Ligand binder design. Structure first.
Ligand SMILES: *[C@@H]1O[C@H](CO)[C@@H](O[C@@H]2O[C@H](CO)[C@@H](O)[C@H](O)[C@H]2NC(C)=O)[C@H](O)[C@H]1NC(C)=O
Ligand SMILES: *[C@@H]1O[C@H](CO)[C@@H](O[C@@H]2O[C@H](CO)[C@@H](O)[C@H](O)[C@H]2NC(C)=O)[C@H](O)[C@H]1NC(C)=O
Ligand SMILES: *[C@@H]1O[C@H](CO)[C@@H](O)[C@H](O)[C@H]1NC(C)=O
Ligand SMILES: *[C@@H]1O[C@H](CO)[C@@H](O)[C@H](O)[C@H]1NC(C)=O
Ligand SMILES: *[C@@H]1O[C@H](CO)[C@@H](O)[C@H](O)[C@H]1NC(C)=O
Ligand SMILES: *[C@@H]1O[C@H](CO)[C@@H](O)[C@H](O)[C@H]1NC(C)=O
Ligand SMILES: *[C@@H]1O[C@H](CO)[C@@H](O)[C@H](O)[C@H]1NC(C)=O
Ligand SMILES: [Fe+3]
Ligand SMILES: [Fe+3]
Length: 504
């Protein structure tokens, strides 16, 4: 495979092939397979440092429709027993419990409230080490989980890396999603990054009817952008074989907004997952940082204020200033919305976020950016401010996890497909920053008339990526497509080589 040391490569577009079906609520993997207060939807997340980790789970069925009665989270305890051997769970941690509701004050819409969600932080863990654990409430008969196990991230240092980091976005919960996840799990990742757009509960009305495109079907005929929150529980139950054994870091996408009563947003996302918000001092579920071996990861919020005057930007400045590249040589970011996608879908939609944050990240030598959102695969050449730049980050977009929305297939540079500029900005975040180019091949235009030279590879296929950091200067990236199932199939592969003496 190529190497970024060779410089930028001639752009490649894979010709199109010529929707996905959501898993039904009858699927055995989404049905409730425990009773009473026994734990379900068990999931591990990283803390900010390898020496700590989060275990989360839900106890009790949700309520959908009727006069929902939110549960009292204080009635079921939050206990994890853990240890270095399955028969010796001699350490104990306790944590917090909460519920969330999804309420709509419109006649004919149905309300939802969750089971009790638990989050417990395990402290004093050895890096790079397998821990066995059980979660639940030991004072309630039958309310402890089976024994599970996960491995902590390796110790932070310039020769110490997780073997395989899986990167996915926009999974949803379709049969194609199960293909993505099966392929991903067969690659046995040490860590999963999920770059927003998790369950696509907001493709459904509160009465359970779904669609491939809410705006197309329901935008005009509903009083709000509705959700069917049980899709989250179905997703959490389906994913448990992965999440109970493999740490998973989630960052929010636009499908997590899920606006409800009182203009409340992000309720399900903020409640269901654990984030290292306290440990990384973001104090936000929407953005945070963590170390996995010698990689400093930054998860940024495309859907929280990212302007230079805001809290996120100030936090990012402080986070970057604390990075010691002799301890964590790799600096990698993830967020939902791509900055350099060349598909028509969401073309230049996050331009205001790029304009706000790109120079700061470039000045600190950001190595790789992972995003989702665009339902296709794309890899950029090293780029900064639309210019091929040997010190610019590699931008990779893997929003092709398999949800039921349409694939992104048209390119903004396709003849006649360049969108109207004022149609492109993200409506939820506001602003307009996407001005016509003033230099380069596309000077004076909003789009190129051919694949832009900062786009190395683009393909309209579902799949997932794996990052294999080898040492302080070399990392192997591989993207795997779903329609390929033979042993070792790879759709795109690049050796990413960093040059700190050149760029820092
Ligand atoms: C779902 O929960 C909401 C809030 O608890 C209820 O909202 C009410 O809806 C009516 C119109 O249908 C409004 O006139 C009320 O002002 C709303 N109440 C509040 C506190 O905002 C709603 O009744 C619940 N839906 C069901 C079927 O129980
Ligand atoms: C999503 O999953 C479906 C069903 O598994 C895939 O449907 C197949 O597509 C291939 C071509 O890639 C055809 O050979 C098959 O005949 C299709 N099967 C059916 C039942 O339709 C679908 O291709 C997947 N979607 C994407 C974008 O990969
Ligand atoms: C849900 O409500 C919508 C619009 O009110 C309706 O078209 C649809 O048929 C309903 N679905 C069910 C299962 O009732
Ligand atoms: C409603 O919620 C969103 C997200 O917090 C916010 O951006 C928006 O400005 C709020 N709307 C009003 C009228 O306050
Ligand atoms: C990016 O390019 C535009 C157009 O040349 C320029 O006006 C702008 O100042 C550049 N931004 C940075 C951070 O250099
Ligand atoms: C920007 O480029 C588009 C074509 O991509 C063109 O239609 C538009 O008029 C241009 N606007 C300006 C201010 O140059
Ligand atoms: C770093 O990793 C690459 C790929 O595994 C290897 O070729 C190289 O020798 C390693 N160390 C260096 C260049 O210092
Ligand atoms: Fe998406
Ligand atoms: Fe999205």
């Amino acid at each position: 495979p190529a190497s970024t040391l060779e410089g930028p490569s001639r752009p490649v577009t894979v010709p199109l092939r010529e929707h996905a079906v959501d898993l039904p609520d009858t699927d055995p993997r989404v049905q409730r397979r425990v009773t009473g207060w026994a734990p379900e939807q068990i999931a591990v997340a990283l803390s900010a440092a390898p020496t700590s980790a989060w275990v989360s789970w839900i106890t009790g069925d949700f309520q959908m429709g009727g006069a929902v009665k939110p549960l009292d989270p204080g009635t079921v305890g939050s206990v994890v027993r853990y240890g270095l051997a399955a028969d010796s769970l001699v350490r104990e941690a306790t944590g917090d419990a909460l519920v969330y509701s999804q309420l709509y004050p419109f006649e004919g819409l149905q309300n939802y409230t969750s089971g009790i969600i638990h989050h417990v932080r395990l402290q004093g863990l050895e890096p790079g080490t397998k821990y066995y654990y059980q979660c639940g409430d030991p004072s309630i008969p039958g309310a402890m989980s089976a024994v599970h196990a996960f491995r902590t991230m390796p110790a932070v240092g310039p020769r110490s890396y997780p073997g395989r980091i899986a990167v996915v976005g926009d999974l949803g919960l379709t049969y194609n999603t199960t293909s993505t996840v099966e392929h991903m799990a067969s690659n046995q990742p040490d860590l999963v990054l999920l770059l927003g757009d998790v369950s696509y509960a907001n493709l459904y009305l509160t009465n359970g009817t779904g669609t491939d495109c809410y705006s197309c079907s329901f935008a005009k005929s509903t009083p709000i952008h509705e959700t069917y929150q049980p899709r989250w529980d179905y997703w959490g139950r389906y994913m448990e074989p992965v999440t109970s054994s493999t740490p998973m870091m989630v960052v929010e996408g636009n499908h997590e907004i899920e606006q409800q009563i009182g203009n409340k947003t992000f309720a399900a996302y903020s409640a269901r997952f654990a984030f290292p918000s306290m440990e990384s001092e973001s104090f936000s579920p929407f953005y945070y940082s963590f170390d996995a071996g010698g990689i400093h990861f930054i998860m940024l919020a495309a859907y929280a204020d990212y302007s230079k005057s805001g809290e996120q930007y100030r936090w990012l400045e402080k986070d970057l200033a604390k990075v010691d590249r002799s301890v964590t040589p790799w600096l990698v970011a993830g967020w939902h919305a791509p900055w350099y996608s060349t598909y028509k879908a969401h073309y230049r939609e996050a331009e205001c976020m790029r304009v706000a944050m790109e120079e700061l990240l470039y000045s600190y030598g950001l190595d790789i950016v992972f995003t989702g959102h665009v339902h296709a695969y794309e890899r950029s050449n090293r780029v900064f401010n639309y210019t091929l730049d040997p010190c610019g980050a590699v931008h990779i977009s893997v929003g092709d996890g398999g949800n039921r929305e349409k694939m992104a297939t048209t390119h903004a540079d396709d003849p006649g497909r360049c969108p109207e500029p004022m149609s492109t900005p993200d409506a939820f975040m506001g602003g307009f920053c996407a001005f016509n180019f003033t230099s380069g091949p596309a000077a004076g235009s909003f789009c190129w008339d051919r694949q832009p030279d900062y786009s190395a590879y683009r393909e309209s296929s579902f799949g997932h990526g794996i990052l294999e950091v080898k040492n302080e200067t070399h990392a192997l990236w591989k993207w795997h497509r779903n329609q390929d199932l033979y042993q070792g199939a790879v759709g795109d592969e690049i050796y990413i080589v960093r040059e700190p003496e050149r760029c820092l």
